[PDB]
Design an enzyme around this catalytic site. Structure first.
Site, PDB file in Angstrom:
ATOM      1  N   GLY D 132       0.775  -1.231   0.000  1.00 33.51           N
ATOM      2  CA  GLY D 132       0.000   0.000   0.000  1.00 33.51           C
ATOM      3  C   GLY D 132       0.807   1.282   0.000  1.00 33.51           C
ATOM      4  N   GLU D 135      -2.150   6.536  -3.223  1.00 30.33           N
ATOM      5  CA  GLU D 135      -3.363   7.077  -2.619  1.00 30.33           C
ATOM      6  C   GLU D 135      -4.104   7.901  -3.666  1.00 30.33           C
ATOM      7  N   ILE D 167      -4.799  -0.888  -5.264  1.00 32.17           N
ATOM      8  CA  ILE D 167      -3.831  -1.797  -4.667  1.00 32.17           C
ATOM      9  C   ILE D 167      -4.062  -3.241  -5.103  1.00 32.17           C
ATOM     10  N   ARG D 248      10.172  -3.423 -10.529  1.00 34.26           N
ATOM     11  CA  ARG D 248      10.359  -2.879 -11.866  1.00 34.26           C
ATOM     12  C   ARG D 248      11.289  -3.739 -12.705  1.00 34.26           C
ATOM     13  N   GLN D 284       4.122  -7.619 -47.924  1.00 31.57           N
ATOM     14  CA  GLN D 284       5.213  -6.801 -47.409  1.00 31.57           C
ATOM     15  C   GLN D 284       4.811  -6.040 -46.143  1.00 31.57           C
ATOM     16  N   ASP D 341      -4.103  -5.431 -34.564  1.00 27.38           N
ATOM     17  CA  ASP D 341      -4.477  -4.942 -35.881  1.00 27.38           C
ATOM     18  C   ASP D 341      -4.296  -6.033 -36.936  1.00 27.38           C
ATOM     19  N   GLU D 368       4.104   1.415 -11.272  1.00 30.02           N
ATOM     20  CA  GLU D 368       5.539   1.291 -11.024  1.00 30.02           C
ATOM     21  C   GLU D 368       6.284   2.359 -11.826  1.00 30.02           C
ATOM     22  N   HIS D 371       5.486   6.070 -17.999  1.00 30.97           N
ATOM     23  CA  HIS D 371       6.478   6.169 -19.059  1.00 30.97           C
ATOM     24  C   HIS D 371       7.190   7.531 -19.001  1.00 30.97           C
TER      25      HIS D 371
HETATM   26  C1  LIG Z   1      27.680   7.396 -50.325  1.00 29.65           C
HETATM   27  C2  LIG Z   1      27.462   6.051 -50.974  1.00 29.65           C
HETATM   28  C3  LIG Z   1      28.532   5.172 -51.139  1.00 29.65           C
HETATM   29  C4  LIG Z   1      28.358   3.900 -51.765  1.00 29.65           C
HETATM   30  N1  LIG Z   1      29.466   3.072 -51.925  1.00 29.65           N
HETATM   31  C5  LIG Z   1      29.292   1.877 -52.564  1.00 29.65           C
HETATM   32  C6  LIG Z   1      30.425   0.987 -52.785  1.00 29.65           C
HETATM   33  O1  LIG Z   1      31.553   1.240 -52.416  1.00 29.65           O
HETATM   34  N2  LIG Z   1      30.177  -0.193 -53.465  1.00 29.65           N
HETATM   35  C7  LIG Z   1      28.862  -0.540 -53.932  1.00 29.65           C
HETATM   36  O2  LIG Z   1      28.761  -1.573 -54.517  1.00 29.65           O
HETATM   37  N3  LIG Z   1      27.809   0.260 -53.722  1.00 29.65           N
HETATM   38  C8  LIG Z   1      27.974   1.450 -53.062  1.00 29.65           C
HETATM   39  N4  LIG Z   1      26.929   2.267 -52.871  1.00 29.65           N
HETATM   40  C9  LIG Z   1      25.610   1.945 -53.329  1.00 29.65           C
HETATM   41  C10 LIG Z   1      24.682   1.140 -52.350  1.00 29.65           C
HETATM   42  O3  LIG Z   1      25.214  -0.177 -52.197  1.00 29.65           O
HETATM   43  C11 LIG Z   1      23.513   1.187 -53.178  1.00 29.65           C
HETATM   44  O4  LIG Z   1      23.126   2.596 -53.211  1.00 29.65           O
HETATM   45  C12 LIG Z   1      22.242   0.533 -52.751  1.00 29.65           C
HETATM   46  O5  LIG Z   1      22.437  -0.906 -52.621  1.00 29.65           O
HETATM   47  C13 LIG Z   1      21.577   0.975 -53.988  1.00 29.65           C
HETATM   48  O6  LIG Z   1      20.128   0.718 -54.183  1.00 29.65           O
HETATM   49  P1  LIG Z   1      19.467   1.861 -54.917  1.00 29.65           P
HETATM   50  O7  LIG Z   1      20.251   3.142 -54.465  1.00 29.65           O
HETATM   51  O8  LIG Z   1      19.401   1.677 -56.299  1.00 29.65           O
HETATM   52  O9  LIG Z   1      18.117   1.812 -54.395  1.00 29.65           O
HETATM   53  P2  LIG Z   1      16.763   1.203 -54.836  1.00 29.65           P
HETATM   54  O10 LIG Z   1      16.291   0.394 -53.697  1.00 29.65           O
HETATM   55  O11 LIG Z   1      16.788   0.612 -56.027  1.00 29.65           O
HETATM   56  O12 LIG Z   1      15.620   2.233 -54.725  1.00 29.65           O
HETATM   57  C14 LIG Z   1      15.403   3.077 -53.534  1.00 29.65           C
HETATM   58  C15 LIG Z   1      14.152   2.652 -52.693  1.00 29.65           C
HETATM   59  O13 LIG Z   1      13.485   1.442 -53.237  1.00 29.65           O
HETATM   60  C16 LIG Z   1      13.128   0.631 -52.044  1.00 29.65           C
HETATM   61  N5  LIG Z   1      12.943  -0.728 -52.555  1.00 29.65           N
HETATM   62  C17 LIG Z   1      13.763  -1.402 -53.452  1.00 29.65           C
HETATM   63  N6  LIG Z   1      13.335  -2.632 -53.717  1.00 29.65           N
HETATM   64  C18 LIG Z   1      12.194  -2.784 -52.974  1.00 29.65           C
HETATM   65  C19 LIG Z   1      11.267  -3.917 -52.830  1.00 29.65           C
HETATM   66  N7  LIG Z   1      11.412  -5.073 -53.453  1.00 29.65           N
HETATM   67  N8  LIG Z   1      10.199  -3.693 -51.968  1.00 29.65           N
HETATM   68  C20 LIG Z   1      10.020  -2.505 -51.299  1.00 29.65           C
HETATM   69  N9  LIG Z   1      10.829  -1.416 -51.372  1.00 29.65           N
HETATM   70  C21 LIG Z   1      11.904  -1.602 -52.222  1.00 29.65           C
HETATM   71  C22 LIG Z   1      14.361   0.823 -51.198  1.00 29.65           C
HETATM   72  O14 LIG Z   1      14.194   0.302 -49.917  1.00 29.65           O
HETATM   73  C23 LIG Z   1      14.496   2.322 -51.235  1.00 29.65           C
HETATM   74  O15 LIG Z   1      13.789   3.020 -50.280  1.00 29.65           O
HETATM   75  C24 LIG Z   1      27.053   3.547 -52.217  1.00 29.65           C
HETATM   76  C25 LIG Z   1      25.951   4.429 -52.046  1.00 29.65           C
HETATM   77  C26 LIG Z   1      26.125   5.672 -51.436  1.00 29.65           C
HETATM   78  C27 LIG Z   1      24.919   6.578 -51.289  1.00 29.65           C
HETATM   79  C1  LIG Z   2     -17.377  -4.916 -34.144  1.00 34.53           C
HETATM   80  C2  LIG Z   2     -17.436  -5.320 -35.598  1.00 34.53           C
HETATM   81  C3  LIG Z   2     -18.622  -5.176 -36.316  1.00 34.53           C
HETATM   82  C4  LIG Z   2     -18.711  -5.565 -37.687  1.00 34.53           C
HETATM   83  N1  LIG Z   2     -19.927  -5.421 -38.349  1.00 34.53           N
HETATM   84  C5  LIG Z   2     -20.009  -5.837 -39.648  1.00 34.53           C
HETATM   85  C6  LIG Z   2     -21.268  -5.738 -40.377  1.00 34.53           C
HETATM   86  O1  LIG Z   2     -22.283  -5.282 -39.894  1.00 34.53           O
HETATM   87  N2  LIG Z   2     -21.280  -6.207 -41.679  1.00 34.53           N
HETATM   88  C7  LIG Z   2     -20.109  -6.763 -42.299  1.00 34.53           C
HETATM   89  O2  LIG Z   2     -20.233  -7.149 -43.420  1.00 34.53           O
HETATM   90  N3  LIG Z   2     -18.942  -6.847 -41.647  1.00 34.53           N
HETATM   91  C8  LIG Z   2     -18.850  -6.409 -40.352  1.00 34.53           C
HETATM   92  N4  LIG Z   2     -17.692  -6.514 -39.685  1.00 34.53           N
HETATM   93  C9  LIG Z   2     -16.511  -7.068 -40.280  1.00 34.53           C
HETATM   94  C10 LIG Z   2     -15.554  -6.080 -41.040  1.00 34.53           C
HETATM   95  O3  LIG Z   2     -16.221  -5.612 -42.214  1.00 34.53           O
HETATM   96  C11 LIG Z   2     -14.531  -7.044 -41.316  1.00 34.53           C
HETATM   97  O4  LIG Z   2     -13.976  -7.395 -40.009  1.00 34.53           O
HETATM   98  C12 LIG Z   2     -13.303  -6.668 -42.076  1.00 34.53           C
HETATM   99  O5  LIG Z   2     -13.660  -6.242 -43.423  1.00 34.53           O
HETATM  100  C13 LIG Z   2     -12.787  -8.041 -41.958  1.00 34.53           C
HETATM  101  O6  LIG Z   2     -11.430  -8.368 -42.466  1.00 34.53           O
HETATM  102  P1  LIG Z   2     -10.749  -9.385 -41.580  1.00 34.53           P
HETATM  103  O7  LIG Z   2     -11.283  -9.089 -40.135  1.00 34.53           O
HETATM  104  O8  LIG Z   2     -10.921 -10.703 -42.004  1.00 34.53           O
HETATM  105  O9  LIG Z   2      -9.352  -9.041 -41.747  1.00 34.53           O
HETATM  106  P2  LIG Z   2      -8.172  -9.527 -42.624  1.00 34.53           P
HETATM  107  O10 LIG Z   2      -7.638  -8.326 -43.290  1.00 34.53           O
HETATM  108  O11 LIG Z   2      -8.456 -10.571 -43.397  1.00 34.53           O
HETATM  109  O12 LIG Z   2      -6.903  -9.762 -41.779  1.00 34.53           O
HETATM  110  C14 LIG Z   2      -6.398  -8.793 -40.787  1.00 34.53           C
HETATM  111  C15 LIG Z   2      -5.097  -8.053 -41.251  1.00 34.53           C
HETATM  112  O13 LIG Z   2      -4.683  -8.437 -42.624  1.00 34.53           O
HETATM  113  C16 LIG Z   2      -4.253  -7.168 -43.266  1.00 34.53           C
HETATM  114  N5  LIG Z   2      -4.326  -7.430 -44.704  1.00 34.53           N
HETATM  115  C17 LIG Z   2      -5.353  -8.069 -45.386  1.00 34.53           C
HETATM  116  N6  LIG Z   2      -5.134  -8.148 -46.695  1.00 34.53           N
HETATM  117  C18 LIG Z   2      -3.920  -7.543 -46.892  1.00 34.53           C
HETATM  118  C19 LIG Z   2      -3.135  -7.305 -48.113  1.00 34.53           C
HETATM  119  N7  LIG Z   2      -3.521  -7.672 -49.321  1.00 34.53           N
HETATM  120  N8  LIG Z   2      -1.927  -6.646 -47.913  1.00 34.53           N
HETATM  121  C20 LIG Z   2      -1.497  -6.244 -46.670  1.00 34.53           C
HETATM  122  N9  LIG Z   2      -2.160  -6.419 -45.498  1.00 34.53           N
HETATM  123  C21 LIG Z   2      -3.368  -7.073 -45.658  1.00 34.53           C
HETATM  124  C22 LIG Z   2      -5.306  -6.223 -42.744  1.00 34.53           C
HETATM  125  O14 LIG Z   2      -5.012  -4.898 -43.060  1.00 34.53           O
HETATM  126  C23 LIG Z   2      -5.252  -6.527 -41.271  1.00 34.53           C
HETATM  127  O15 LIG Z   2      -4.322  -5.822 -40.538  1.00 34.53           O
HETATM  128  C24 LIG Z   2     -17.548  -6.105 -38.309  1.00 34.53           C
HETATM  129  C25 LIG Z   2     -16.329  -6.248 -37.592  1.00 34.53           C
HETATM  130  C26 LIG Z   2     -16.246  -5.869 -36.251  1.00 34.53           C
HETATM  131  C27 LIG Z   2     -14.925  -6.053 -35.531  1.00 34.53           C
END
Ligand SMILES: Cc1cc2nc3c(=O)[nH]c(=O)nc-3n(C[C@H](O)[C@H](O)[C@H](O)COP(=O)(O)OP(=O)(O)OC[C@H]3O[C@@H](n4cnc5c(N)ncnc54)[C@H](O)[C@@H]3O)c2cc1C
Ligand SMILES: Cc1cc2nc3c(=O)[nH]c(=O)nc-3n(C[C@H](O)[C@H](O)[C@H](O)COP(=O)(O)OP(=O)(O)OC[C@H]3O[C@@H](n4cnc5c(N)ncnc54)[C@H](O)[C@@H]3O)c2cc1C
Ligand SMILES: Cc1cc2nc3c(=O)[nH]c(=O)nc-3n(C[C@H](O)[C@H](O)[C@H](O)COP(=O)(O)OP(=O)(O)OC[C@H]3O[C@@H](n4cnc5c(N)ncnc54)[C@H](O)[C@@H]3O)c2cc1C
Ligand SMILES: Cc1cc2nc3c(=O)[nH]c(=O)nc-3n(C[C@H](O)[C@H](O)[C@H](O)COP(=O)(O)OP(=O)(O)OC[C@H]3O[C@@H](n4cnc5c(N)ncnc54)[C@H](O)[C@@H]3O)c2cc1C
Lengths: 390, 390, 390, 390
Positions: D132, D135, D167, D248, D284, D341, D368, D371
């Site tokens: 305790g 308060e 408590i 904690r 993704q 979510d 405890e 934040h």
């Molecule tokens: C100062 C500096 C020095 C460097 N020195 C060297 C070195 O000595 N030798 C060397 O080999 N390289 C070097 N690099 C290059 C570094 O290795 C490359 O820049 C990096 O790997 C390059 O990718 P990008 O710049 O084409 O980006 P990209 O990724 O092609 O494009 C940019 C954006 O796309 C996003 N992205 C890409 N693919 C996906 C996906 N599939 N899904 C979701 N998002 C995606 C990335 O996350 C990013 O935000 C250097 C770079 C800098 C800036």
């Molecule tokens: C209190 C309550 C009341 C409701 N009332 C009704 C109603 O009256 N009528 C009705 O029809 N429905 C109703 N619903 C349902 C609501 O419409 C559905 O819950 C929602 O559309 C359902 O999707 P899920 O719950 O299956 O989620 P899902 O999306 O299947 O799965 C959950 C997660 O997957 C993620 N996700 C899904 N697909 C992808 C993708 N392609 N890429 C990336 N992320 C993805 C979502 O964003 C989420 O975070 C209700 C739900 C609640 C909770």
């Protein structure tokens, strides 16, 4: 000059009618709803009367013209949603369903017979409706629904088989608007009524969000539906998606009501609560939080107003609604969470209400399109490239 | 129906004049400013001509009525700022100073003689002005300024001693609007002119933000100022703070221009750039970022519009401006940073411009009130309790 | 008992040798490197001597056993990287390349002849090397590289054609480790030397990150490489990816050095700088920021220590390195940005150094795998499902 | 080589005894606790037996040497907390109180008579204790407590008057460790026992966090306490604060258990749940979330290990514990929220458990030390300047 309760003066953007509607409803919400919410939410009790009461007030399906409906503006609808959610999301959910997911589709895709027959009763709250779209294996992806409707050429009727889950209002619904895939590949909307043989609506238990709302399933064991009970205006996902946008619009407005409630509660608490010899409001850490809450609420309010005006001019696109729905629900959730942290230990008590809003907004940020789905919707519109699937 | 370049249709909220003003200026910015920015920013070169050019266009001090000024709306001013910053914050900074920190105070707190004498030249860009408020030991707290002005009853003049630092335009300024604490306790505004004995304005080096902008100090070694060079309408912090709100309003709009530029650049890049056999825009992670950028930009744009309308109705409070200035600058910074990450390695090259905006917005989020100071300003307004000091 | 400079007592986790190595190098970094960084970064000047100096100290390729290398622990390598980056990321980049991207591959995949011939010179800093992997159309996706190597059976040599871009050290490199796709489908590593006909290494201009580092391209116009210059131990992406993990490990440690520098600078500034009659450090908003910085730095430091120990036991997996590289670079970036905001206007001056670190960490968070790519790497490991492509 | 369930190989850092202790307890938690938690949390039922069971296992007050206690390491204590919270925070709360807030103080500040008399019964779970301190008007600030203890020189006893609220365990407690301010200004600890005249412990209702935990008040209406029931080793806030650090420490470990549970649940769900023809884990957006969760959990786990080792060497400072308590509770909260979510609609059902953890961690991040309070504690340690008050 500055009024923290309305930073950018939304008031001067509303019409006298809209303001009148808002205040009148606010009074009802504070006098009749707030007093029942504590125990309602605590013991999961939804008062059926609530729908009748709102029916008498003529708040149900307010944007509909005729059939006993108010025929008010979209902004008025938004204002109504905001006052309802200021009380509780569960309550606003019941109203969103009745108005946008039940009355609207019957109004836009129904036959004149169906309108004449159902709208007047729905408007007065005599009938409680529900919207059956989601299924156990079909949530974010509607094309995966398994509910099927087989046509009986002889009886000129359809037979439905399937399961809808997480459906708001289903356990005490009288009218069910169900969406099922047809033999031709198109998905249509069917009107079912309690009592139909093979139709069950058991309640869902264990909810820790929207507890003051009745939520259940819709089990269809070979339910036979007359042809006249089919919605002639919908064919494939466009019908439900269209209705969905109307509900989402109301949601974008509503969550701001819950946010405002959380802001007001946290603020007053910070002024009344004292520690270290001063009110919590004296602390910088506390003031920054309040500033953030007010900022996000304000940005959302004026954006919603704009959307509402565009809507009445028939210039609102679905993407616009996704943008605000996603934004406001996400921001509202953060606000309720911050408020809860600000009330400390007392914040976990439902007696202080904030914990209820934080829990409720969890569900709101999920249904009617998840936060990430709406991002993808915007992403497709921005890039012209779809990224939902691979 | 949905246009990602203007989600909530801001266009239909603008007057034909405002739209005309925006487009006309946009053309100038893209044709005359964009082509000089790459090397300007790279080698820290501010082209004095820029002020003359904007002067001919009549963009300087646009809201002022008479004295050779356009006399346009606040929204028009915001639109102008947005197009300028879409190019570069340094450039918009030079214009904010001339318009809101130099011309405005002379207009609102000056004598008719001072207006007649300075406004016409400032409007045409013949004179470059600067605003001297900040000092080495006085930034977020103006009450700490050490610059003092002693009155010489015999000569009917004042003698100023002090140092202003981080002053935009000072190194090439002709007119200096300086604020100093007087013997009576009140702080007044003095108009100084290049050439006055004891007045120095050395340039500041080593800047890695707003490089295309000239930034220096104002050293006053016993500078004698005639009484007629004193601003008769300001007495204590209210004069500068008042001017500050006008500059901040323009800033809230401007940063949205830089954000939009970053959004457009990142978007196009995501569509053109290919990795893993598809455009980057195909990735979910990429699309979410674009959705977030568009969302924040949109919320800020419509909020700014509202503020602009209130401003012209004389219903804008300082807190309103703090709210949007703080919000838009903070959000703009995050957007530029995300864009930079999205262009990968190329993003650190000024040839791709995004890195320039990210650097520039660093300074913008600091001057005209830091992000945290504006939070406290809002906090005081919300709680009625001051929390700047302890 | 609590020492904010080492919250969880990392010191008692290090061996006497590691501590000795760290301090000795620290002295060199503070005495010889810090004094040249201001102008080096401002005018983009990389002092070739730096590599010779570190060579004499025996810091180059420290984990290598024999060939004139120190043969120290992985933790020692991490400690060295941290002290170098505490000064500047560009400088640490030059060292990462020489050690992990040049010396390591020659050591692990080279022939004994190549080791005998190159390691001793690289260790002493007599030769400056570079690593050529990235290309204009091949960054996050190496399988898209277009550099090809054709075999000449008659001359027993290969002919390389292609372009590497964004290559650290290339403009003043003597040895080039290039990766090219071969006719058999496998990608191999080739050792090129300045002077080879057809080999060009022009410098890249316009960088606003890692300015004290020399960055250029590697253009190969039919460069003929003797068979003996091919790395016999690498076959397909495994060679480069393997080397990449060693560089990434050093990076995870290094960025913590830059963070610590930013924390120390912001802290001292908050204590010395006064506004509102008290030091900035007196404000809650300021103290929370410092607490966050210290927290993240600490979590990363002890995680890196653990990884370093596992590494020396040959129990380190690539995913482990991705986790810390992604975490520390992302967190380091946020820390430098916060520090910059905390120094206000002065923060945009390179005289205060924080702006330099914030800019540098931009590039560090991109190269050696972007923040999102590393997330996907972890995602694949966690789910067993690849999500890079669609 | 990489195991996502233990990225940095914590396993090889534990002793055989610690590992044995963990697994043995884990078995008990999964077999006896998990099966009762669903309804326990749903109907707010705390099973008193749980304390008896843990008593037989010898898990109560594990670090205490003698008196029937295990006498295990601090790391073992942390491991125990992690397994308990992996089930439910409410359950771990009951154990934290018994071990660190009841047994520890009696052990460190009690007389030998009190130890002999209470420890054995507390260790075996025969007596349920509570702490305790808080308060109605004294939470983050203990100096504001109003509970007073007046000395009765004649009876050689004290009379307590006051109210403790929020408590844990009070409604079914047998032993009460209460802190009250004395006439001399010092605050001391008193041992009260159920049955004492004037002592009441009513239950608190309306909790929406830690529902499986019994929470109530301690009302003292002139309760007379014998002198022998006073803790001779505590004088002013140091006694409670000392105990607080032990609780904690256990909390910093525990929340990682809840996080891991949320990570595992979200992961499995993402693999089993299918939408758009593929498992959610294929997206993704989903994979990034999992990567973030694993990253934060890992950083916290190894930091806690280090703290645990320092603790056993008597080298742990209170600030160290604040750092990890604040970090892990904040991060754990975000993780549970993300997981919720990720399960979509199902996530709001307690049948899926995640919603329970998200709610529970709300309270854990508050008690405890909040934040923000812990941030200030760190801030004071870093700057040497106190910022709690103004
Ligand atoms: C100062 C500096 C020095 C460097 N020195 C060297 C070195 O000595 N030798 C060397 O080999 N390289 C070097 N690099 C290059 C570094 O290795 C490359 O820049 C990096 O790997 C390059 O990718 P990008 O710049 O084409 O980006 P990209 O990724 O092609 O494009 C940019 C954006 O796309 C996003 N992205 C890409 N693919 C996906 C996906 N599939 N899904 C979701 N998002 C995606 C990335 O996350 C990013 O935000 C250097 C770079 C800098 C800036
Ligand atoms: C209190 C309550 C009341 C409701 N009332 C009704 C109603 O009256 N009528 C009705 O029809 N429905 C109703 N619903 C349902 C609501 O419409 C559905 O819950 C929602 O559309 C359902 O999707 P899920 O719950 O299956 O989620 P899902 O999306 O299947 O799965 C959950 C997660 O997957 C993620 N996700 C899904 N697909 C992808 C993708 N392609 N890429 C990336 N992320 C993805 C979502 O964003 C989420 O975070 C209700 C739900 C609640 C909770
Ligand atoms: C490119 C550029 C151009 C400029 N041009 C001009 C110009 O033309 N005219 C002019 O007058 N000025 C100009 N300035 C200066 C600008 O007005 C000042 O930089 C700003 O007001 C200065 O405060 P400071 O830099 O001293 O910051 P300080 O705030 O003193 O210190 C920095 C940090 O302290 C925090 N802080 C301060 N007080 C508190 C508190 N009470 N509680 C919590 N946190 C606190 C701040 O938020 C910030 O993060 C310019 C600045 C820049 C960078
Ligand atoms: C489930 C549960 C079980 C508990 N069990 C026990 C128990 O067994 N024994 C016991 O003694 N206590 C117990 N407590 C209480 C816990 O110890 C207290 O709730 C906490 O210390 C109380 O502070 P408060 O709730 O009054 O918060 P307050 O902090 O007073 O107010 C809430 C907000 O004010 C902020 N704040 C406060 N001061 C400042 C400042 N100076 N600057 C900036 N921000 C500030 C806080 O950070 C927080 O966000 C329990 C609480 C809960 C919820």
């Amino acid at each position: 000059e500055f009024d923290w309760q309305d930073p950018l003066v939304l008031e001067e953007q509303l019409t006298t009618d809209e303001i009148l509607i808002r205040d009148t409803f606010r009074t009802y919400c504070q006098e009749r709803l707030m007093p029942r919410i504590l125990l309602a939410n605590r013991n999961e009790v939804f008062h059926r009367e609530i729908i009748s009461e709102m029916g008498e007030l003529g708040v149900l399906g307010p944007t509909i013209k005729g059939y006993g409906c108010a025929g008010v503006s979209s902004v008025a609808y938004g204002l109504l949603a905001r006052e309802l959610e200021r009380v509780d999301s569960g309550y606003r959910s019941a109203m969103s369903v009745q108005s946008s997911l039940v009355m609207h589709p019957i109004y836009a895709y129904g036959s004149e017979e169906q309108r004449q027959k159902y709208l007047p009763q729905l408007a007065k709250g005599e009938l409680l409706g529900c919207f059956g779209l989601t299924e156990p294996n079909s949530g974010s992806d509607p094309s995966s629904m398994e509910t099927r409707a087989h046509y009986n050429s002889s009886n000129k009727s359809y037979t439905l088989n399937g399961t809808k889950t997480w459906i708001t209002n289903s356990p005490m619904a009288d009218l069910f608007v169900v969406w099922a895939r047809c033999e031709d590949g198109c998905i249509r909307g069917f009107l079912l009524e309690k009592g139909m043989r093979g139709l069950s609506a058991p309640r869902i238990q264990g909810k820790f969000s929207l507890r003051a709302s009745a939520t259940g399933m819709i089990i269809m064991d070979g339910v036979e539906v007359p042809e006249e009970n089919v919605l002639p205006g919908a064919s494939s996902l466009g019908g439900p998606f269209g209705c969905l946008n109307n509900a989402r619009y109301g949601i974008a407005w509503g969550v701001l009501g819950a946010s405002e409630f959380c802001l007001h509660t946290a603020r007053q608490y910070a002024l009344d609560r004292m520690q270290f010899g001063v009110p919590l409001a004296r602390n910088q850490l506390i003031q920054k939080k309040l500033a953030d809450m007010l900022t996000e609420i304000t940005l959302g309010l004026h954006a919603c107003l704009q959307l509402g005006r565009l809507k009445d001019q028939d210039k609102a696109a679905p993407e616009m609604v996704s943008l605000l729905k996603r934004n406001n629900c996400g921001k509202a959730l953060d606000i309720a969470r911050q408020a809860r942290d600000m009330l400390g230990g007392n914040g976990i008590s439902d007696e202080y209400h904030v914990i209820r809003h934080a829990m409720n907004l969890e569900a709101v940020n999920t249904y009617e399109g998840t936060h990430d789905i709406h991002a993808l919707i915007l992403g497709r519109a921005i890039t012209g490239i779809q990224a939902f699937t691979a």
